[PDB]
Amino acid sequence: REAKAKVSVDNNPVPTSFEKWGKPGHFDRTLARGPKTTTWIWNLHANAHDFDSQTSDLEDVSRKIFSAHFGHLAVVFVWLSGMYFHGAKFSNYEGWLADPTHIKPSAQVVWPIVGQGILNGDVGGGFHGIQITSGLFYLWRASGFTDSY
Amino acid sequence: VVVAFGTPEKQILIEPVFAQWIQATSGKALYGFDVLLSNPDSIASTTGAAWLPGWLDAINSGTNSLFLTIGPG
Ligand code: CLA
Ligand code: CLA
Ligand code: CLA
């Protein structure tokens, strides 16, 4: 995949494995020797993304950063899709779109238990739920969404 | 959390039984304990002490700040 570009990659620098998943603290040489004090635990979380304190190679650090960027983008995609699905199968977006001025934008229905069902207040059109303030319904109307599908 | 969900009936209200009993030992008849100075048939209440009538009258009149009635709060 050169295409007369400036691209330069390494075809296999890191093998894929699961063994290091069983060694918490593999990235830190001071933590690989195993815990002796409780501080060991805390530092394990403090230096998790501290790639500079894990290796003095700028290239490996840039690679870790790039893959971490990809992972975070996957996380934000998961969150955005969760919001879209909750607007799809758990919201009153259509009943709201049919008459906005007399209904409250609701989403996230609560399971009636231990009394918590009281949080599903009437928002209009017979829908019962938690009124959302993120303004997703207004954004979706601006985008032109008409159907929950 | 119990009062919040519109179900205030599930509050854990536990009666201060020991302190109410202690009040009764000083002649407090509101809780119906009939123990020591709250019981007229008790030996400690029939000793002829000039301080018993006024003490019982002040501790059994819910108008002052002497041995205030206590609830679970
Ligand atoms: C179990 C409780 C609970 C749950 C999970 C939700 C869920 C949700 N609510 Mg709701 N809400 C709640 C309680 C809850 N709410 C309560 C008590 C109220 C007051 C009545 C509301 C009122 C409310 C409003 C007004 C709105 C929402 C909205 C939302 C959505 C926004 C997304 C979000 O908040 O991301 C999460 C945000 C965070 C800050 C993350 C918190 C950190 C967690 C707790 C740590 C655990 C994560 C774990 C470690 C993940 C591992 C990380 C790894 C994968 C990398 C979401 C699906 C919005 C919506 O549009 O609904 C669709 C919206 O407008 N909620
Ligand atoms: C199942 C596929 C798989 C497997 C077997 C491995 C295997 C390995 N990887 Mg790796 N990697 C993968 C996918 C995978 N990777 C992906 C998808 C990415 C891009 C995000 C990376 C990017 C990457 C980097 C930058 C590094 C490794 C490293 C390692 C090695 C040690 C990891 C460690 O310390 O414990 C394992 C630790 C965990 C499993 C942490 C789990 C908590 C995660 C991060 C939170 C969830 C976020 C997640 C990434 C995205 C959302 C998940 C989704 C379900 C919502 C190990 C042999 C490290 C290495 O080279 O060792 C020196 C290292 O630096 N990988
Ligand atoms: C341009 C938008 C943006 C930016 C700037 C960030 C930035 C960041 N995110 Mg976030 N994220 C975003 C959008 C964004 N996020 C969205 C839309 C979602 C879906 C709700 C998430 C959900 C998400 C999760 C679940 C996690 C991150 C994490 C992180 C941090 C990566 C780990 C690190 O840097 O070490 C550590 C960083 C710190 C110690 C700084 C403290 C961060 C403070 C508390 C908030 C920073 C503001 C940040 C923009 C909001 C992130 C929300 C998230 C923490 C709940 C990083 C600072 C991971 C993290 O917080 O690392 C532990 C983490 O687990 N993100």
Side-chain angles (χ1 to χ4, degrees), chain A residues 23-28 31 38-49 54:
Chain A
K23 315 182 183 296
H26 65 86
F27 50 81
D28 197 319
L31 307 179
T38 48
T39 303
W40 176 95
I41 301 170
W42 303 118
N43 310 346
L44 179 140
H45 308 73
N47 310 334
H49 308 156
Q54 302 176 14

Side-chain angles (χ1 to χ4, degrees), chain A residues 42-117:
Chain A
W42 303 118
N43 310 346
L44 179 140
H45 308 73
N47 310 334
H49 308 156
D50 199 332
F51 296 158
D52 295 334
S53 58
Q54 302 176 14
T55 169
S56 63
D57 186 17
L58 185 57
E59 194 181 49
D60 193 11
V61 164
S62 307
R63 295 167 172 180
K64 298 166 183 285
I65 290 167
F66 205 15
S67 44
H69 289 181
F70 280 122
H72 172 276
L73 259 198
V75 174
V76 177
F77 271 135
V78 166
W79 171 83
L80 208 47
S81 67
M83 302 315 109
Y84 271 100
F85 186 92
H86 256 271
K89 287 188 181 177
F90 292 88
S91 76
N92 62 340
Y93 172 69
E94 284 180 331
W96 166 85
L97 200 31
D99 184 24
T101 64
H102 295 95
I103 194 177
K104 296 305 183 297
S106 177
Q108 181 219 354
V109 198
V110 197
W111 290 334
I113 197 180
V114 308
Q116 79 188 220

